Design a protein around this motif. Sequence first.
Motif, PDB file in Angstrom:
ATOM      1  N   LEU C   1       0.830  -1.190   0.000  1.00  0.00           N
ATOM      2  CA  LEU C   1       0.000   0.000   0.000  1.00  0.00           C
ATOM      3  C   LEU C   1       0.870   1.247   0.000  1.00  0.00           C
ATOM      4  O   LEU C   1       1.973   1.251   0.554  1.00  0.00           O
ATOM      5  N   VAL C   2       0.365   2.317  -0.607  1.00  0.00           N
ATOM      6  CA  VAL C   2       1.066   3.594  -0.627  1.00  0.00           C
ATOM      7  C   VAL C   2       0.060   4.708  -0.400  1.00  0.00           C
ATOM      8  O   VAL C   2      -0.945   4.795  -1.108  1.00  0.00           O
ATOM      9  N   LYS C   3       0.342   5.574   0.560  1.00  0.00           N
ATOM     10  CA  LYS C   3      -0.552   6.656   0.927  1.00  0.00           C
ATOM     11  C   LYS C   3       0.053   7.992   0.540  1.00  0.00           C
ATOM     12  O   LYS C   3       1.265   8.189   0.638  1.00  0.00           O
ATOM     13  N   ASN C   4      -0.807   8.907   0.116  1.00  0.00           N
ATOM     14  CA  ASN C   4      -0.403  10.252  -0.257  1.00  0.00           C
ATOM     15  C   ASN C   4       0.501  10.259  -1.476  1.00  0.00           C
ATOM     16  O   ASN C   4       1.338  11.143  -1.635  1.00  0.00           O
ATOM     17  N   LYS C   5       0.344   9.284  -2.355  1.00  0.00           N
ATOM     18  CA  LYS C   5       1.046   9.313  -3.625  1.00  0.00           C
ATOM     19  C   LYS C   5       0.087   8.852  -4.699  1.00  0.00           C
ATOM     20  O   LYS C   5      -0.460   7.753  -4.604  1.00  0.00           O
ATOM     21  N   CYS C   6      -0.128   9.690  -5.702  1.00  0.00           N
ATOM     22  CA  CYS C   6      -1.127   9.383  -6.709  1.00  0.00           C
ATOM     23  C   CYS C   6      -0.812   8.056  -7.354  1.00  0.00           C
ATOM     24  O   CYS C   6       0.266   7.875  -7.920  1.00  0.00           O
ATOM     25  N   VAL C   7      -1.760   7.139  -7.287  1.00  0.00           N
ATOM     26  CA  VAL C   7      -1.557   5.778  -7.751  1.00  0.00           C
ATOM     27  C   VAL C   7      -2.800   5.327  -8.479  1.00  0.00           C
ATOM     28  O   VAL C   7      -3.916   5.690  -8.102  1.00  0.00           O
ATOM     29  N   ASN C   8      -2.613   4.548  -9.528  1.00  0.00           N
ATOM     30  CA  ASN C   8      -3.700   3.680  -9.898  1.00  0.00           C
ATOM     31  C   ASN C   8      -3.871   2.651  -8.798  1.00  0.00           C
ATOM     32  O   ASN C   8      -2.965   2.411  -8.006  1.00  0.00           O
ATOM     33  N   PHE C   9      -5.054   2.059  -8.724  1.00  0.00           N
ATOM     34  CA  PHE C   9      -5.256   1.020  -7.729  1.00  0.00           C
ATOM     35  C   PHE C   9      -6.390   0.109  -8.151  1.00  0.00           C
ATOM     36  O   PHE C   9      -7.185   0.432  -9.032  1.00  0.00           O
ATOM     37  N   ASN C  10      -6.447  -1.039  -7.493  1.00  0.00           N
ATOM     38  CA  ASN C  10      -7.561  -1.955  -7.597  1.00  0.00           C
ATOM     39  C   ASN C  10      -7.820  -2.556  -6.229  1.00  0.00           C
ATOM     40  O   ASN C  10      -6.887  -2.929  -5.521  1.00  0.00           O
ATOM     41  N   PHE C  11      -9.093  -2.644  -5.870  1.00  0.00           N
ATOM     42  CA  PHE C  11      -9.526  -3.222  -4.605  1.00  0.00           C
ATOM     43  C   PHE C  11     -10.680  -4.170  -4.876  1.00  0.00           C
ATOM     44  O   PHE C  11     -11.758  -3.731  -5.273  1.00  0.00           O
ATOM     45  N   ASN C  12     -10.463  -5.459  -4.653  1.00  0.00           N
ATOM     46  CA  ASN C  12     -11.505  -6.471  -4.806  1.00  0.00           C
ATOM     47  C   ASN C  12     -12.133  -6.434  -6.185  1.00  0.00           C
ATOM     48  O   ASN C  12     -13.220  -6.970  -6.383  1.00  0.00           O
ATOM     49  N   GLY C  13     -11.460  -5.845  -7.160  1.00  0.00           N
ATOM     50  CA  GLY C  13     -12.051  -5.607  -8.453  1.00  0.00           C
ATOM     51  C   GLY C  13     -12.514  -4.185  -8.692  1.00  0.00           C
ATOM     52  O   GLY C  13     -12.641  -3.780  -9.851  1.00  0.00           O
ATOM     53  N   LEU C  14     -12.775  -3.416  -7.640  1.00  0.00           N
ATOM     54  CA  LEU C  14     -12.942  -1.981  -7.809  1.00  0.00           C
ATOM     55  C   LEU C  14     -11.652  -1.383  -8.330  1.00  0.00           C
ATOM     56  O   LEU C  14     -10.593  -1.569  -7.733  1.00  0.00           O
ATOM     57  N   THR C  15     -11.731  -0.659  -9.434  1.00  0.00           N
ATOM     58  CA  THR C  15     -10.553  -0.047 -10.025  1.00  0.00           C
ATOM     59  C   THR C  15     -10.735   1.460 -10.082  1.00  0.00           C
ATOM     60  O   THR C  15     -11.732   1.950 -10.614  1.00  0.00           O
ATOM     61  N   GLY C  16      -9.765   2.186  -9.547  1.00  0.00           N
ATOM     62  CA  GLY C  16      -9.812   3.629  -9.610  1.00  0.00           C
ATOM     63  C   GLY C  16      -8.441   4.174  -9.303  1.00  0.00           C
ATOM     64  O   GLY C  16      -7.508   3.431  -8.994  1.00  0.00           O
ATOM     65  N   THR C  17      -8.336   5.497  -9.359  1.00  0.00           N
ATOM     66  CA  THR C  17      -7.059   6.185  -9.287  1.00  0.00           C
ATOM     67  C   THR C  17      -7.203   7.421  -8.428  1.00  0.00           C
ATOM     68  O   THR C  17      -8.127   8.206  -8.635  1.00  0.00           O
ATOM     69  N   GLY C  18      -6.290   7.609  -7.490  1.00  0.00           N
ATOM     70  CA  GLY C  18      -6.419   8.732  -6.594  1.00  0.00           C
ATOM     71  C   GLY C  18      -5.274   8.808  -5.624  1.00  0.00           C
ATOM     72  O   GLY C  18      -4.190   8.291  -5.879  1.00  0.00           O
ATOM     73  N   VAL C  19      -5.522   9.493  -4.521  1.00  0.00           N
ATOM     74  CA  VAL C  19      -4.568   9.606  -3.435  1.00  0.00           C
ATOM     75  C   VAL C  19      -5.150   8.882  -2.239  1.00  0.00           C
ATOM     76  O   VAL C  19      -6.071   9.384  -1.588  1.00  0.00           O
ATOM     77  N   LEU C  20      -4.591   7.733  -1.911  1.00  0.00           N
ATOM     78  CA  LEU C  20      -5.130   6.924  -0.832  1.00  0.00           C
ATOM     79  C   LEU C  20      -4.703   7.511   0.503  1.00  0.00           C
ATOM     80  O   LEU C  20      -3.526   7.807   0.706  1.00  0.00           O
ATOM     81  N   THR C  21      -5.657   7.715   1.403  1.00  0.00           N
ATOM     82  CA  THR C  21      -5.381   8.358   2.677  1.00  0.00           C
ATOM     83  C   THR C  21      -6.217   7.711   3.764  1.00  0.00           C
ATOM     84  O   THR C  21      -7.308   7.209   3.501  1.00  0.00           O
TER      85      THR C  21
END
Lengths: 63, 48, 88, 20
Positions: C1-21
């Motif tokens: 996991l990476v926080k406060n760094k703009c990342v593509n991501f996927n969670f359980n099949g949910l796919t989106g892009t943002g700043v995880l916090t």
Amino acid sequence: PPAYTNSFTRGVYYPDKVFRSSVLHSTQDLFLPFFSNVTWFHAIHDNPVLPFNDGVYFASTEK
Amino acid sequence: QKLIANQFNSAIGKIQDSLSSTASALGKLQDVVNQNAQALNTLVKQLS
Amino acid sequence: LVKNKCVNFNFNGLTGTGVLTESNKKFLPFQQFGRDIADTTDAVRDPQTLEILDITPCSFGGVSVITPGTNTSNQVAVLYQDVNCTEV
Amino acid sequence: FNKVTNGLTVLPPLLTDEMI
Ligand SMILES: *[C@@H]1O[C@H](CO)[C@@H](O[C@@H]2O[C@H](CO)[C@@H](O)[C@H](O)[C@H]2NC(C)=O)[C@H](O)[C@H]1NC(C)=O
Ligand SMILES: *[C@@H]1O[C@H](CO)[C@@H](O)[C@H](O)[C@H]1NC(C)=O
Ligand SMILES: *[C@@H]1O[C@H](CO)[C@@H](O)[C@H](O)[C@H]1NC(C)=O
Ligand SMILES: *[C@@H]1O[C@H](CO)[C@@H](O)[C@H](O)[C@H]1NC(C)=O
């Protein structure tokens, strides 16, 4: 002679996994229409076989 | 002059309560905002 | 996991892009995503270790150029609209 | 001020409610 009662507001279930907040979200999904009559049973001297139709509610009240 | 001062002043006061207890006095301004937001939402949802 | 760094991501099949916090808001244990008024997938509950993340747009914002006429100078200033001064 | 309530932005008005 199953004697009904008034389903009132019961039968709302989270259709999905999505948390939301303070939001009114509209959904079309199989529900129990409000204030319908519910066939109603007992344990007395009361379990026939009932059709599944679309899908079925259920309940009980217990001690 | 003096009477008129009051009739002025009182009339000032009422305006407040013509407001403080009534939001619908602002209906115009209130709508202009809504219609804006009402666009974007309708615009945003079009993404889905 | 990476926080406060703009990342593509996927969670359980949910796919989106943002700043995880990390976020305070609490879920109901069976609930998974968050959303918002606009149906913008927002919070996410961290599937392995349960915690409430967030999402956030990346930055975007436009670039703008503040100049006295080229007839005067070629010196320009640049307005990055609505970003904290970090990325640039 | 009480009585009132993807690239989408809000640009701040030039003037502001101090100046206004
Ligand atoms: C002219 O009209 C005004 C109001 O329309 C009158 O002022 C009121 O007079 C009554 C008694 O006559 C007082 O009890 C009120 O307090 C007065 N109003 C205010 C705001 O003070 C005024 O008296 C009238 N004058 C004439 C000659 O008719
Ligand atoms: C519910 O039951 C009452 C009395 O039996 C009846 O008048 C009413 O029409 C019924 N409605 C439904 C939807 O079953
Ligand atoms: C614009 O350029 C011309 C020629 O380069 C110059 O004569 C004129 O003064 C300039 N305008 C201003 C406002 O300086
Ligand atoms: C900019 O980012 C810093 C990060 O340390 C934060 O403390 C500050 O509040 C931010 N300011 C704005 C205007 O975003």
